[PDB]
Design a binder for this molecule. Sequence first.
Ligand code: 49R
Ligand code: 49R
Ligand code: MG
Ligand code: MG
Lengths: 546, 546
Amino acid sequence: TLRAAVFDLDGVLALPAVFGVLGRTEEALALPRGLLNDAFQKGGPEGATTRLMKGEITLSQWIPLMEENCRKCSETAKVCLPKNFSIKEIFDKAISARKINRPMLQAALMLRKKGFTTAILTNTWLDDRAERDGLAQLMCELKMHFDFLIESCQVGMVKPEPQIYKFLLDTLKASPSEVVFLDDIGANLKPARDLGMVTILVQDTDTALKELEKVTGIQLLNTPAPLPTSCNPSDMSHGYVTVKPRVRLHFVELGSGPAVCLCHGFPESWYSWRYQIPALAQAGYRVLAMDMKGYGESSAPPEIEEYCMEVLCKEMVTFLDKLGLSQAVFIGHDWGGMLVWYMALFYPERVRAVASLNTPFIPANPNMSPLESIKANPVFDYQLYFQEPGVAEAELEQNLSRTFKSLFRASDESVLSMHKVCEAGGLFVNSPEEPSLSRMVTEEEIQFYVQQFKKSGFRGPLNWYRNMERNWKWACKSLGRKILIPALMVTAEKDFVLVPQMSQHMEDWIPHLKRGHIEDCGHWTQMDKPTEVNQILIKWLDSDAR
Amino acid sequence: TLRAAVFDLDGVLALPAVFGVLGRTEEALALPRGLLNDAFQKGGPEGATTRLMKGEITLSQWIPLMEENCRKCSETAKVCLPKNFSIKEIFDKAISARKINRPMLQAALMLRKKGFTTAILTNTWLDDRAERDGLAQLMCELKMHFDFLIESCQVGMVKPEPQIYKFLLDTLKASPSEVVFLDDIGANLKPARDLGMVTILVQDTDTALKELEKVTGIQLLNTPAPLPTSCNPSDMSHGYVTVKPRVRLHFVELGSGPAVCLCHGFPESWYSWRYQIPALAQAGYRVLAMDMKGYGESSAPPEIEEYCMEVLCKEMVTFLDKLGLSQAVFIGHDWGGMLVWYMALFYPERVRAVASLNTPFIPANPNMSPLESIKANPVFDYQLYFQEPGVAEAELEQNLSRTFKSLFRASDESVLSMHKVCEAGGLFVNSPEEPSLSRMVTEEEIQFYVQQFKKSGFRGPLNWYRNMERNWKWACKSLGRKILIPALMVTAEKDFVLVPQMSQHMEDWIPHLKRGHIEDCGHWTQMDKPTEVNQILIKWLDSDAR
Ligand SMILES: CC(C)(C)OC(=O)N[C@H]1CNc2ccccc2C1
Ligand SMILES: CC(C)(C)OC(=O)N[C@H]1CNc2ccccc2C1
Ligand SMILES: [Mg+2]
Ligand SMILES: [Mg+2]
């Protein structure tokens, strides 16, 4: 029956409410109880506050008017206002004190996820204070999670006026009895209740959620901890830069602040960073998530040398050049992890900080050809399988669905052993035609990859593996150097290819290296343990890159 | 005969040279003359400095080694190093003290513009100091103006080693006698001279330019003041954001720092901001230069209401939302100028600062229908001509070349009077089939516009003019408000449509408004007086938006 949930901001999605700082100030300053609410509501329907809420005047025009009301209120109750009494002060303070009420937002998210149309309906103001950016930020973080945001000041109406509820109903394309409406102010429920909406008086969040959980029959409180926000591809800003004639790079871009460049592994996509993208934007960064050369919407020229580390690096430099960026933070996974270490090593003036998931920094052995180094280790046998142009392309392109559903699996879910892949004749010889979905990925998300690899297949991506000798010679040039810019290394307990112990000597080349470690996490780090990854990168960026 | 010019960075394109801070420090600290050069060059071909220049070690690894050399040099000349002697200090200081030598860069630019292949060839280091960003910035600003940058540390060779000159020759695809090579160090000329290159010992810049001007027979010194850097479209990062199902917005993006959103007028393009784009990036900003709805690579849906101010504004808000930006600086010209004022007025939490070229902020007259307001003023008669869908589309699309060559003209160049356009039957009735090129635009630049308007023509752009009544009703909602966020207004002496006196009352609605004024500048402000515009915006951004 119920199909939509409507939330207020002040006192429901963000706490503490500002009306509440009207109370605390009163106590704080031993003013007459209510004096500040009295001043705030003066003249009711025709007073300053209503005009403000209706968009007739801006916050900064309003401040002086509330001063006047406070001056008149204090005169009628025969009390003096304290030397230095500042409405601007009180409100600046109140406004930044208010935060997203995490449980409420999560309840809204849940309900959205089980089918509800959700909305913010709020009495608010046109904010033009010097410190307005605060609220702009909050409102951005909130609005993305809702189907609608309806603001008193944008529509010229306010609660409890019966018409805003009609506008509400109209925007929802629902009928009053399919709506739950939550508010902290009883007056604003009355018109919702009159049309026959379920209404929740929100005092403590938890009890409001109990009523909400009861009346929608969905579990909301005590639910498991949810995944970080994902990206909807077609809601992203997509960016494109030609770095030389036959080669353009695609990326997705979110947030402002220090530029942070995310480099995915083999055989993946910008989409591999879907869980990090909003978190780091949210954390105060300009995330640039790449399609690395050879993938998705980036160019994929056929030649093998187009993919040696050197060419790949100069190309990332040029990407900075044309975007007008003097440095970026480089963060990489797997193959992208190898690339960023090498970026630190040949272009440190352009790297603000460097960080890798799974991929250790290992130097070239000037004594031992890299092909040989690779045969010494059974788990790397698949890298040999990848040498012959055509062979791996054929097997991996033959069924895309199957490929990604076979590769993208948690530690406890595997279907392909990396064991003697050459001998077996393939990566999937001993694995299913129709593998089950990994707990880590939806059907939809598999298709996204599928559709990306339909543009260029696997020739480009596989090439990255086919300059073993060329990268070795180049790598040797850096053997005298050390990495001395900020550097994070994140090991995954259960990557059985890029194992933690492989990273163990890294401190010799990177004396000041920082570490994070993720337990119970296989190879596909970002999607396997998205929460822990975000926690580790944001902490390190805030401390080493800012 | 001469076809290429090669420049060094230290002491030729950037001054003061760092080797020179080795001298000044000596004097400054009353050390033995040369002691610091001695330490710097210790061991020659096999000493620390050569290894550094060759890319064998990074700057931070080198610092301690030069300390050692300085300690050993001071011991052999039997003198003590001053308590607190710091090579890191000296170099941090020296490195940020060095600036682009504007006249040299201009000479290089000129020579490039008359056909030369130009290059930076320099002995430099892999810089990994905490303050490396300085040099990264300098190198970005310089490298864009050259065909090549060849760095000792990237190629493993150094001047005066004869092979770097062979690599040079090879990269130029020129022969030694078509090359002028300028350096401040005589030793590094000797191998250039040996192969038979013209060489210039650069002591004072001016005399070096005289030799350079003499030997290439091009004027370099005393030349007129050049235009700001333009954009090459295909060297830009192009960005694309879907703001709702049938509507995506294109933009071009350059630089980092506060986001600054440029909004072009009618009938123009992001390309209209080609002179501002590098300057503001250079000035420390993230320039986002739009194709406004209806233009170039942005969507151009046919319906008229798709272009009322309201829809246009909510759409720019959404553009911020999806790019993850809480505010941007809004800067507008002409129609884009109208839009930004309205953005300040309905969404000030999202506008960090507002600024318009030519377009005053004028309120709606609640007493007088806007059509009527428009007939009261003869110069606005063309806005009436634009009302009838089809009429203006036909005339403007009939010959694109002709259109833009007729519209884009300096104050002293005009061909169309705006006078009684309706009566005449068109905008071009009394103007040429083949107009001459305006001094403001190259043939190439006209074509760029031409090709842009081939995607959608003029239906979209013209619509902006076709919601007079709708924008009026909406505008009236803001009549109680004032603009109190930072605000710049820039009048063009010789815009005979958007005349300076039209802006004269703006202080009533915008008490703290700031002004700039450009003399001898017609309607096409950005391209007519690009230098003065950049000077005015950068000064105001630095002071009001940062
Ligand atoms: C290049 C380095 C040595 C850094 O790691 C990798 O080979 N990565 C992964 C890529 N996913 C994947 C997929 C199939 C088989 C093996 C792998 C190993
Ligand atoms: C919309 C406002 C009132 C702000 O200004 C304009 O009509 N701009 C210009 C556009 N260029 C142009 C081109 C042809 C004719 C008239 C004009 C006037
Ligand atoms: Mg409330
Ligand atoms: Mg020199």
